[PDB]
Structure formats: C-alpha cells, structure tokens
RNA sequence: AGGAGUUGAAGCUUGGUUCAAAGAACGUAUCAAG
C-alpha cells in the first residue's frame, strides 16, 4: 500500500508538467512492479503468486514459514530505508502479513471479506505508526539549510550543479520526453531512474543500447509488446501512453 | 315702403400590410506545448 500517492503524482508546478504528470503516473506503478518481484526474487519464487497489481496496491499470497519472516522483516526494513533516502515523507509502502488456516480460505465457514478486513486493519495500523524512534531522529538530524530549492519536489538536498531541479525531478522529465509505445524498459545497476534495492531504470529505446540484452545477466526486462519468446525473456507492464501528435499546435 | 329666418345639417376621423434581416460572437502575447 503506498500512500499519498496523488500529492507525489500532483507535486509538480514547473514548466514541463505535461510529461512530469505522465512520469510520476508511470514511475509510481513500475516502483510497485519492481518491488513486488523483487520480494518474489528473493522468496525464490515465481509470479504466479501476485493476485493482483494495481494503483498502490499489490494483494500477494506466499508460504507461512518463519524463514519467510525473517527475509520479510529485512525487506520491511530495506524498503523503509531506501524510501525514507529518497522521498523523506511522501511515499511509504504499508506491508503487513496476516495468516489464515488452510480450512479457511475453503470459505465453507465463510470469512473471506474479513481476511480482506483484517488485511485492511493491519495495514491502517501500521500507516497510524509509521516510523521508529531513530528513523525520526535521523530524519530530523540530516536537515540543512540551503540557498537553493528545485522547484517541483521542494527539496534542499541532493540537487544537480548550474541548474536547480532535484535530480528525480529531472530524471522523470528526461525519461517522460523518450517514452513511446513500442518502448522497453529495462533495470540494471546503471540507469536513469532510482529504484531499490540500488538498481535503476534505463528506459532505453530500440537503439545502440540494446546490445545489454546478450549477455543480460542481473538484469530484468519490462515491455509493452511480446513477440519472441526465447532468449528475450520480456514480461509485459500495463501502461497506456497514446498520444496523437504531442504537439498541441498541430493538433489543432 | 319692404319686413323675418335658415348662415350650414347629417356621416366617416384613418383602413389594411410587413413590426429589428444578414455578418462577426472575442483575436492575440506572456502562462503552456514543443
């Protein structure tokens, strides 16, 4: 569940907000995408156990063994600190496992829409209290002072040289200009776009690029279109980009 | 030898016909998009 997803989407005001508003809208759903496989990837297991995906949400159904966790509260704590790098506040994702018998999921003594219940109740439990004592002692010790701001994401760190547009700020409205239809998407340990656990996101076209996909080894492929199914290996993101002209003038 | 008595009376006082028609209905510049 990540929360305030509108004000991350909406917390632009610069002059690019056309491809800034279509970059967050995408950014949001592919950070959810890697982070739901990726947690698949490191329970050695398949993505048949993704029920659903959507807007910040991501129902998952996995094994009830204490090794699970463990690697469950590490990717609690990873994910938590990787946010909390980047986005101080604004994005935060709301994992919280609940258990359920075998005889209760046959639904023969009902109790299915309160599984969602209690799921819906862990999850606003854990949003009540959200971070711990030394994330908030951290979070109010690495504040400084600055001259300087980028303008959409209001943010005095981590800011580029000679031009004053926070380095995501950027990064989304690079990306967002080559974005097109029949696109890829691809992940790697050099990229454009910051994802955890330290791995990016390209976003590459059909280019001089394409030549990582020999040898393609730690690195993952995120497509709009499927045709060969041998050695490419591209599973399809659901994300629709029709634009006519991009130019409004000749469109009109 | 001329005297009187009528000095105008009645009727219609406008009738019908189209009673605003066609045009423009904001254009641009910053803002934005590229």
């Known amino acids: 569940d990540m929360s305030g997803v509108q004000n991350f989407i909406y917390n632009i005001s610069g002059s690019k907000a056309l491809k800034s508003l279509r970059a967050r809208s995408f950014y949001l759903d592919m950070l959810l995408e890697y982070i739901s496989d990726n947690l698949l990837e490191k329970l050695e297991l398949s993505r048949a156990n993704i029920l ?3 807007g ?3 129902y998952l159904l996995l094994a009830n063994t204490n090794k699970t966790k463990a690697i469950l509260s590490d990717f609690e704590h990873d994910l938590k600190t990787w946010f909390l790098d980047k986005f101080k506040i604004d994005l935060y994702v709301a994992m919280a496992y609940t258990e359920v018998s075998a005889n209760d999921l046959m639904n023969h003594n009902g109790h299915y829409r309160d599984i969602y219940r209690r799921l819906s109740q862990k999850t606003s439990a854990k949003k009540a209290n959200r971070y711990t004592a030394e994330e908030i002692l951290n979070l109010n010790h690495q504040g400084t002072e600055n ?7 209001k943010r005095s760190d981590l800011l580029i040289e000679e031009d004053d547009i926070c380095e995501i700020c950027d990064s989304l409205q690079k990306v967002s200009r080559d974005l097109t239809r029949e696109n890829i998407f691809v992940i790697a340990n050099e990229g454009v776009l910051d994802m955890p656990f330290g791995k990016k996101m390209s976003a590459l076209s059909y280019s001089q690029a394409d030549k990582l996909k020999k ?4 690195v993952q492929i995120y497509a709009k279109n499927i045709s060969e199914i041998g050695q490419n290996l591209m599973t399809r993101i659901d994300m629709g980009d029709y634009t006519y002209r991009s130019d409004f003038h000749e469109m009109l």
């Open 52 to 54: 659903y995906v959507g």
């Open 56 to 58: 910040g949400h991501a």
């Open 147 to 153: 001259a300087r701001e980028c303008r959409e994401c």
């Open 215 to 218: 040898s393609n080894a730690e």
